[PDB]
């Protein structure tokens, strides 16, 4: 969750999530572009991101 | 002296019509084929404008319309409209 800024008419918000590899790389799972404010991911697995 | 060719045009004028000899007759506005088959009203503006090229409007009664927009602008409100009540949970 966040807060919402000064924005002149719409708000959109865009999440993306990433994924440290194992080398020291990164990795894309997943993307969204939604309206309300909370947000809940599930089934994740590995470690870092 | 003489003032000749008086070249009277009584029916000229019929010529367009006589109820234009009583009354200019309303305007009317051109149609849009982008705006469906809807007619525009020229006395009446029932979407909210933008505030720019549209000059400021008139009213002289009734008429639930629209407007010209000034400023819009989107933030987070706050908990609590006023006084000791604030509670959130």
């Not at chain 1, 800024?5 to 990795?27: H, Y």
């Not at chain 1, 809940?40 to 991101?49: P, V």
């Not at chain 2, 009203?41 to 549209?54: E, R």
């Not at chain 2, 010209?68 to 908990?79: F, K, L, Y």
Request: glycine share 12%; hydrophobic share 40%.
């Amino acid at each position: 969750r966040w807060d919402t800024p000064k924005v002149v008419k719409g708000v959109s918000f865009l999440l993306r999530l990433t994924v440290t590899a194992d080398d020291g790389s990164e990795r894309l799972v997943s993307t969204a572009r939604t309206t309300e404010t909370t947000y809940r991911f599930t089934q994740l697995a590995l470690g870092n991101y | 002296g003489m003032t000749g060719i008086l070249f009277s045009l009584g029916a000229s004028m019929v010529l367009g019509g006589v109820a234009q000899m009583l009354a200019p007759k309303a305007r009317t506005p051109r149609i849009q084929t982008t705006d469906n088959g809807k007619q525009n009203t020229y006395f009446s503006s029932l979407d909210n404008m933008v505030a720019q090229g549209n000059v400021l409007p008139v009213l002289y009664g009734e008429m639930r319309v629209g407007s010209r927009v000034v400023s819009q602008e989107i933030s987070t409100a706050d908990e609590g409209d006023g006084g000791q009540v604030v509670v959130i949970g």
